[PDB]
Amino acid sequence: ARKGILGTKLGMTQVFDENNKVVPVTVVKAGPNVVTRIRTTERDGYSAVQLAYGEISPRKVIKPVAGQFAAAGVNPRRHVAELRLDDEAAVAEYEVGQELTAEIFSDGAYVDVTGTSKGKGFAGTMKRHGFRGQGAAHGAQAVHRRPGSIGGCATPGRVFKGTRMSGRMGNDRVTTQNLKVHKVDAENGVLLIKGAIPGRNGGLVVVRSAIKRG
Amino acid sequence: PKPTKGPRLGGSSSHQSALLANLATSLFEHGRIKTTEPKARALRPYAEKLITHAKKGALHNRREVMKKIRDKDVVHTLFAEIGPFYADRNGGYTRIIKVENRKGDNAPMAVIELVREK
Amino acid sequence: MIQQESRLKVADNTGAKEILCIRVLGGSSRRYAGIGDVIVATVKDAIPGGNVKRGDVVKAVVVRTVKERRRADGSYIKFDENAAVIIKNDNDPRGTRIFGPVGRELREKKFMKIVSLAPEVL
Amino acid sequence: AVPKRRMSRANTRSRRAQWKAEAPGLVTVSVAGQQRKVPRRLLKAARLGLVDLD
Amino acid sequence: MNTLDFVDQASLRDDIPTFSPGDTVNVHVKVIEGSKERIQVFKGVVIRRQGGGISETFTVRKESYGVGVERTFPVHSPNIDHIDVLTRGDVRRAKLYYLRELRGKKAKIKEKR
RNA sequence: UGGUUUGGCACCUCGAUGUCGGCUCGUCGCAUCCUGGGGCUGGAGCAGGUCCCAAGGGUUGGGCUGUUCGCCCAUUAAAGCGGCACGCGAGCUGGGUUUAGAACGUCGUGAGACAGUUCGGUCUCUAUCCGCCGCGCGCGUCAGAAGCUUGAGGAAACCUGUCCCUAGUACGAGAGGACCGGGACGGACGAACCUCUGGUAUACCAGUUGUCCCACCAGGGGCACGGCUGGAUAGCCACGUUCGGACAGGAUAACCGCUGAAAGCAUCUAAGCGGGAAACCUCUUCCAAGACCAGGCUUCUCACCCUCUAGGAGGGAUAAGGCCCCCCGCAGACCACGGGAUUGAUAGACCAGACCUGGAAGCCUAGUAAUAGGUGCAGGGAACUGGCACUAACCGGCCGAAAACUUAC
């Protein structure tokens, strides 16, 4: 129904289309993964499949997680996530212990990307929210970049909870939809995605089959 | 080397360079020096780079070290004794030891020394 | 890369020398002009004996820009002085001779007479 | 600006309480035949005798 | 090492002649015209070059009817057919930005012999 | 009906309620500008006139007067009407109005005045509370920990234009010129990103003026906005690169209906059954079990004492785990967050590469000279990538676990 696969962001690079075009792409290493658990309606109340990724030494992991993985019947891994399906026929396809690779996708099929944004740190209003400052000369009094008026006078007499103003930004989940896929390399198990995707070098990223149009 | 991520130490790049050179020459002359921790942290790579330049003795290296530290006696003693003594060692030319805090300003110190085990 | 209240050099034989940008067409609050865009402007200085005297209002099209412009292939273009061409309603030139080279985008912008009359194209 | 009213005693004490200091940890080190306590941040200094102890 | 090297190598283009900034060069560029292609020749001088491995780029300049023109090409662009170096130059700096304020005879560059 | 202009009453505030526009920033109503759906026409069609429903989004840039108001210049769909102490000076601007000069004109013989005119004229305050934007410590979820998730419940966004087909067809004397449905290309706004273009680069490179210094030549350094000039690796950004504006379903307002007596007929209705929109509910993204009904699926340990007086409680010693200190980051106000601790590539150095810069010193040669050529893709170098335990993470300290019971099985 809706296929999915984990991976990691690597960097940027160019590729030239057969029609002699130019299109920047991103390199994503969708490494092999394993299935550790399956969620069924009568057991949990929904349908989804659990995945795992990453190579870690056995002594790193903690004992409860090690025991869970041993009961599942696979070696330890670093990260774990799940894909939420919509029916029972689809989940019937997946079984515990199965191995998935990047081949599952085909070129020309639009997908979605999920990840975390950058860390920008505390920032001013004009930068975080794109306010417009005021005159930098002709009689300023050190109000070059501060917003200014904030609300009414005695009616109602508050700040109208939800007003847009200064505060920290970034470091949150962000997703983009219907991104074109250019080429797939089997031996290297890497993806070439047109455009730019969120995240940082050596970060975590999960890609899913397109919903809007796919 | 990596430039200081935050604001400079003394209040100017010129002061940074001058203080760093003074600390380097004092270290070379004495061998053991104790001062504030951040100063030693900043100094360590500079001393390592200077000893690297010293290791492969030659006229060009002589000119460079002179240009940097500006003291004939210190350069002479350096290339007379230190250079050969570090012939067989690759990297790791200095060590920093944390020491007790100050009383006037409550700012930590640290002592740095030249490796002498071998 | 032209905005309001700009000075552009005319590369035509109609008699105009410099025209004063008024604003650019193509949509409400259209801000930036690019190669192959219809613009309305007024002439400031012109040859005394020219067909059109100073102070009239006319329409023109940008043909040369000084700001690097991305080409779909990857090549780039910039010129040493902005140039525009006097045009009328029928999307044809008012003059008869074009001076200096002209860009390539006019071909896919459908201005055929200008490209045909141009001495060189790029 | 300026404050309008004198706050309550309970409010004052409650806000004041949080303002305090925290003690550091200690480690046992043996030098010259007797054991004395020093912070772990000074272990090497104590071992090499570069820190004076009263 | 440019960890992307194992992906860049596949698209890397060989058979590109060596050259240096400040040299007279002419380039053959492919073009599409109403579904029919032709070969267009552009003769000029190079003034800058950014090292970019797969993304390395260079520029060419020519004077035409009293108004200068320049172009930028990706070094590995398939639209490029032949690079034909003509002469060898000699300038102290690797960038020739200062030419933009010179006209006529002043734009001439010494020939390397 | 509205209390929004000009008005009438003096009831709260002269041991103070600081004032018109403009800048920035909202929020609300519909008496609707477009965007949407209908109907009646003195509706051929395009295009017009009028009425009904509908508040999700948008509503430009300039010239003139301080101006409000108002006139004008060029496009788009439009350049909507109003309230919130004629929104907002403990956010800002002082152009006139309302201080002290002087002048013009008038009135007054005079000291002066004249909602008549012209010129310049000090805008104070270190955040106690409410509120708001973010982040922490503590505490319960009924043995104590750890991984993964359901979603009650909330927030974010909701914009359009041009062109080509259908077809010069329907229509119309001609001129002129369609509904509906497809296809291609654009404006604004927002989010992400640094691979191409651009901005930045206080320990990079080269040249160069003056001066002082290292015995002197050579070669170097300090200072003079980095002394001034020509260049940029990384990171952060836009003028740069991608992508977003739904489709579909459910129930509705305006309207159009099918079957039908009261009331032998008729009627969309009083019983019933149907169609019908950027309006409402799911459907898109994000937050979310402090939701006290304190959720769900799993794994780990489920055991050693002492005391008061045996009713429970307190104290000490432990397992699972956690914390402190240490090296770090693109995580960062501090905290927290993420990785690492010799069973090791976390940082530093070394080597190597990419990259930047542009041809080192010494020697030799030619030239009296100032200079050029060979040794030579030369010399120097931070941010990107790989190997190497050479240096630094250590003979280490602190917290941390079932009063129980009742009912059917």
Ligand SMILES: [Mg+2]
């Ligand atoms: Mg933004």
Ligand SMILES: [Mg+2]
């Ligand atoms: Mg501004």
Ligand SMILES: [Mg+2]
């Ligand atoms: Mg001030």
Ligand SMILES: [Mg+2]
């Ligand atoms: Mg200021």
Ligand SMILES: [Mg+2]
């Ligand atoms: Mg009264």
Ligand SMILES: [Mg+2]
């Ligand atoms: Mg009263």
Ligand SMILES: [Mg+2]
């Ligand atoms: Mg009163």
Ligand SMILES: [Mg+2]
């Ligand atoms: Mg007062």
Ligand SMILES: [Mg+2]
């Ligand atoms: Mg007020």
Ligand SMILES: [Mg+2]
């Ligand atoms: Mg006021």
Ligand SMILES: [Mg+2]
């Ligand atoms: Mg109404």
Ligand SMILES: [Mg+2]
């Ligand atoms: Mg209508």
Ligand SMILES: [Mg+2]
């Ligand atoms: Mg009507």
Ligand SMILES: [Mg+2]
């Ligand atoms: Mg409305």
Ligand SMILES: [Mg+2]
């Ligand atoms: Mg809306």
Ligand SMILES: [Mg+2]
């Ligand atoms: Mg005026």
